[PDB]
Enzyme design. Sequence first.
Site, mmCIF file in Angstrom:
data_model
loop_
_atom_site.group_PDB
_atom_site.id
_atom_site.type_symbol
_atom_site.label_atom_id
_atom_site.label_comp_id
_atom_site.label_asym_id
_atom_site.label_seq_id
_atom_site.Cartn_x
_atom_site.Cartn_y
_atom_site.Cartn_z
ATOM 1 N N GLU B 171 12.927 3.634 -3.622
ATOM 2 C CA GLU B 171 12.708 4.745 -4.537
ATOM 3 C C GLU B 171 11.391 4.599 -5.298
ATOM 4 O O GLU B 171 10.665 3.611 -5.188
ATOM 5 C CB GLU B 171 13.862 4.812 -5.570
ATOM 6 C CG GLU B 171 14.321 3.411 -6.046
ATOM 7 C CD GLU B 171 13.221 2.635 -6.710
ATOM 8 O OE1 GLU B 171 12.636 3.032 -7.699
ATOM 9 O OE2 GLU B 171 12.915 1.519 -6.108
ATOM 10 N N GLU B 314 10.619 0.331 -4.716
ATOM 11 C CA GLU B 314 9.907 0.984 -3.626
ATOM 12 C C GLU B 314 10.488 0.650 -2.249
ATOM 13 O O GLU B 314 10.056 1.190 -1.245
ATOM 14 C CB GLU B 314 8.400 0.604 -3.596
ATOM 15 C CG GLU B 314 7.611 0.776 -4.899
ATOM 16 C CD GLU B 314 6.157 0.482 -4.663
ATOM 17 O OE1 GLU B 314 5.726 0.158 -3.569
ATOM 18 O OE2 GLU B 314 5.408 0.620 -5.733
#
Lengths: 346, 346
Positions: B171, B314
């Site tokens: 994310e 991430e």
Amino acid sequence: LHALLRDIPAPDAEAMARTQQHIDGLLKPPGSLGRLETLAVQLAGMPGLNGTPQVGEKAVLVMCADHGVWDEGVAVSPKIVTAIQAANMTRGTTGVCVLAAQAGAKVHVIDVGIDAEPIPGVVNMRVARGCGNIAVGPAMSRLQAEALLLEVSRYACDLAQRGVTLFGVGELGMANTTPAAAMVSVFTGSDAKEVVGIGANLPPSRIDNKVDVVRRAIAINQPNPRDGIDVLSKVGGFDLVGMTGVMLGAARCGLPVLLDGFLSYSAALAACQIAPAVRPYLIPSHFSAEKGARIALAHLSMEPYLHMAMRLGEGSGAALAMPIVEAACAMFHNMGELAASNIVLP
Amino acid sequence: LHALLRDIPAPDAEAMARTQQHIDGLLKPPGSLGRLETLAVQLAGMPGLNGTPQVGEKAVLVMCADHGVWDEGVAVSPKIVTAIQAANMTRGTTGVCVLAAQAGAKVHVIDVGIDAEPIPGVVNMRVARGCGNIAVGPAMSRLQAEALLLEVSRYACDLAQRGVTLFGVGELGMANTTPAAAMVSVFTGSDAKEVVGIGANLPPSRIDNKVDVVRRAIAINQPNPRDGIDVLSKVGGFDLVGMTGVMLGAARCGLPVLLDGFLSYSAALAACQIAPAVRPYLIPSHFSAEKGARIALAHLSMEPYLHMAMRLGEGSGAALAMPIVEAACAMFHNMGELAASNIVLP
Ligand SMILES: Cc1cc2ncn([C@H]3O[C@H](COP(=O)(O)O)[C@@H](O)[C@H]3O)c2cc1C
Ligand SMILES: Cc1cc2ncn([C@H]3O[C@H](COP(=O)(O)O)[C@@H](O)[C@H]3O)c2cc1C
Ligand SMILES: O=C(O)c1cccnc1
Ligand SMILES: O=C(O)c1cccnc1
């Protein structure tokens, strides 16, 4: 040898400061990549790496040898398996072979004392056909230990000359978790019961004998914990000494070495005892499932990256961690910068 | 959606038994490769893998979105960083980008709700420009959550059709550790103080406010812990819902998914609450340095392989673990057999 020890380079604090500054400016919140950041900086400080976290060629050195202590009933695998497995190393079918290929590393099988005929394809540095049974005397002479340390050390650094920048260390030797446990007990001051494990599936009923064997080894030899070479020679083995030599050699060459499991911890303790300057070059891999693993690591003050419940040896854990080292280099060199994105964080 | 959930395949016990037997006969003491062995068997049971531990193409899906709760002073990074970083994802300069390239995986950036103009190159699945501020109401409507779950689910499985066999989830969203902490508290029954962390370097003095914000979110919304979709919609975010959808989609496709860090744990809790059949497809990566990490993992009953003190998100931890998965496959297929070497162990 004294020379060699004397010449181990200290880490480059300047390069490390530069490294730290670069890492702080990368496209992420500072310190967010944790150990991956500390690893890059550690690498930057190694003189053989040229002031940056870099990975060229990789090699795993597997030290093979038999032990007289096998005769004490401390290992369930037949003695011949050392010789058998050593040949297999030449065919690329073993665990370290498979994992090394995966990581793009080359495996170097070295015979430091297998009790069998010489195996073609294997580098011959055989000291004797198996070491002495530590239960009733010493594994070898001090002279023997010293010469092997030296020989392996030079071989290790020579590889550096051929483009190798990352080493991994490993072994092969039925009954080797016995001398490993003894050394651990000696260097660490822990009681044998606390650091003696099941090795290659030794049955829980056979444990007690293995513990007795360790204490006997210690009692009889009276190894000096403040003398790493004394300990190795007395209650070590050719394989463990060879692993220690890889460590001394990489350090002298100012290059990093990835540890493996329990056996390697043993060797690392000895190396560090012999030359503390060696410490900064060592990099943990995984957390071995051997009972004495926690104690050994604590004394090295090392926290491994991988928790895989692994206990095969051969340098398999070392091969597995190689990509992590390469990741720290990738991070360092290929990530973008905050500044370039006009990103400002407090 | 109910359909989708209904159709998640159970693991193939037959394939798993065959896998276990093969692994036991490999050139090593049985069980010596630990978690690397259990991982291979887990993979063998996944129907999309064709009865063996196999790795084809790899993809990391990064779900980007902004959160209204940012306005509560729970994050030090400017809001725009989401949009900025999302574009960077398209240039391959970010942490997940660098690590993914390293692992030979492709990064798919998906916009599920960034509060900025659309970014060219980014897959557009934007629900709205940022979600609602959970402190004063719900993040979104149930309908909205459901539709996004569905949409991401299908996108995930479609990739399977194109050769992807391994997924990683990630994310991007300033302030996202806030809704993550809330969900964790709800699903786990832990007090907010216990699971609220520093996120992207939030100053220790600002913590208390973050804790107050979490409790407020919970109090106001009264999310039902026994209803994963209820929780997500109320105190979640578009990014977290998207991560959950990847999970549902891989499972439906009978394929493995590598978790990342803290945010992903949040999503995994929800997914498992929604469909327990999802569990067997999940694979931990690393042990996030976020305070609430231990609690979340315990509830998932997961022990990560990597201890890197990482906290970037991430999907960087997921990318880092990909080589481990590939190692388990390499072990399985390329190691030799005991029998072939005439090696017999008790
Ligand atoms: C087939 C086989 C392959 C191995 N590769 C490494 N080891 C491991 O087992 C030995 C240490 O365990 P212990 O002290 O109980 O003998 C060493 O060879 C170590 O490398 C192996 C052992 C076996 C049987
Ligand atoms: C430059 C930058 C890059 C990032 N990549 C991931 N995160 C991480 O930080 C956010 C969660 O932390 P908090 O809840 O404190 O905002 C998410 O974007 C997460 O992906 C980043 C954060 C920043 C600043
Ligand atoms: O940790 C190791 O490397 C290990 C443990 C048991 C047996 N052989 C090797
Ligand atoms: O664990 C993570 O993924 C994480 C932790 C803090 C901030 N961003 C991501």
